[PDB]
Structure formats: C-alpha cells, structure tokens
Copies of this chain bind each other. A is one copy, B any other.
Amino acid sequence: PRYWSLYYREKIIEGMEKGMTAKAGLIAHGRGEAFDYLIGERTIEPAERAMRAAVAKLLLAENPVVSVNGNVAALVPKETIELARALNAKLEINLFYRTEDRVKAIAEELRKYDPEIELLGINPTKRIPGLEHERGKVDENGIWKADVVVVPLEDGDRTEALVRMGKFVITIDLNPLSRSARMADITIVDNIVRAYPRMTELAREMKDYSRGELIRIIEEYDNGKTLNDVLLHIRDRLTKLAEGGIWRKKQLD
C-alpha cells in the first residue's frame, strides 16, 4: 500500500508493452511521481480551483478538443472518453513520437471502452508552426479549428506553439515549473488519474450553471496566483515535514 502508485506504474509499463507509450513517456511518468511526492499525492485546492475554471471554459467553448497521447492512453483511456463526452468535445490523438503503429495502438485501446467514439488525429493533415513535422501535425477538424484545447502531460514547446496559434490552452501536469505549465492559460497541477474523473464530475454538475455564472468563474480565475499557491503549498508542506522529522516514520503527514 503504495497500491495506487504501483498500480499506475504497471499501467504505464503495460502501456509501453502494447505500443502506446514511448520510452520517454516512462521517464516523464517518474518526473510526475516526484512532484506528486512533493504535493502529497492528492488533489489540492489550487488544482480544484484550476479544474473549476477549466471546465467552465470548456463548457462555454465553441470547438473544445481534448488531446490524447501515449501516457494518457495508458493511464486513463476510459476517463478521457468520459471527460470528452461530458464536455461534448472532440478527441484527438496527438503525440510527439508519432508512429503509425502507436496511433493504432491508442485508437484500439480507446475503442475498448467506446468502439464508436470519433477519433481525430488518425491522419492529420494540418500542422502547427514552429515545431517539427512529426511533433506538429494536428487535425483539420480538431485542434486546427479549436478555440480551447486540453493538452495533458505535455512537452513544453507544443503548449507555447498552440498559444501562439491563438488556442486557449488547458494543461494537466504535476510539474508546476515545466515550460508547458508556465505557458498554459490554465494549469491544473494534479495527477491526471484524479483530475480527469474530477473534471468529468464537474462538467456534469456545472452544466446546470448559468452562462453568466460560468463567465464570472472564467473571468475571476488567475493562473499566476494559482501556480504560486501550488508552490506555497509545497514549501509549507516541506517546512512542516522537516520540523516534525521524517527519518524512520512509516508514513508522512
């Protein structure tokens, strides 16, 4: 019982056995775990704040798209489908190490929980400026024409590149200091396996809100202060751990 930790470690490993998740993704997974260790492996209020504002924004969007990559496929294939259908958003396979067989692998896995979901990014024809070609392809009907994109667990440069295309970008990422984290319009600092079920629940509830109330939430949100507050949470936590001592303690907190 670090059961959930070890559970998702296996998912990301099987993730790669099945051809969905690159070697780099396994490394990126551990980087997340490290900041999860620092946060306390739970959903903190600043991440709840950011998830509120995100779901509001995504509910008001005209052309919302949630991006899926190798890590997402391995960890939350079911929940990424729920979240999109809750938001009425399109779903676009979108990854850096693009391979035909890796898309297929992700397509199928997604089809395992919904064999009749529409998947963009199978044969993208457009591409974002300022990247590569293999890192840069997007779908004519998804990200290309999106107003709001969710890019989870992402490499820094694509987030910035989407923002300079005038996309409003929402990210889920455990690293609050990543390039991607720094550049996004809304940064949810939380483990995706908590964030996506939570955003799915928020979407179903917040649909009941007025347009006006959703716009107020969106307009009040301050991502700068939110990222500050995530750091401050971590500091205060380290201060308190250190004051109490951790050596030979079975569990922390």
Contacts and interface: CB of A to CB of B under 8 A. Distances in A.
Nearest to A178: B37
Nearest to A238: B235
Interface string A163-189: 000000000000111110111000100
Interface stretch (A23-31, A106-114, A116-124, A139-147): A23-31
A238 B16 CA distance: 33
A248 B31 contact: no
A220 to B, nearest CB: 16
A47 to B, nearest CB: 15
Interface of A is mostly: helix
Interface stretch (A61-69, A81-89, A207-215, A223-231): A223-231
Contact of A37 (B16, B29, B175): B175
Task: Give this chain's copy count.
Answer: 2
Contact of A249 (B2, B32, B183): B183
Contacts of A242: 177, 228-229, 231-232, 235
B248 A239 contact: no
A34 interface: yes
Given A16-B23, A30-B26, A177 B246 contact: yes
A234 interface: yes
A13 interface: yes
Nearest to A224: B247
A16 B181 CA distance: 28
A247 B223 contact: yes
A234 B33 CA distance: 16
Nearest to A34: B34
Contacts of A248: 182-183, 224
A53 to B, nearest CB: 14
Contacts of A35: 34
Interface string A241-253: 1110111111010
Given A37-B175, A224-B245, A232-B239, 7 more contacts: A9-B27, A37-B177, A182-B250, A228-B243, A232-B238, A235-B239, A235-B242
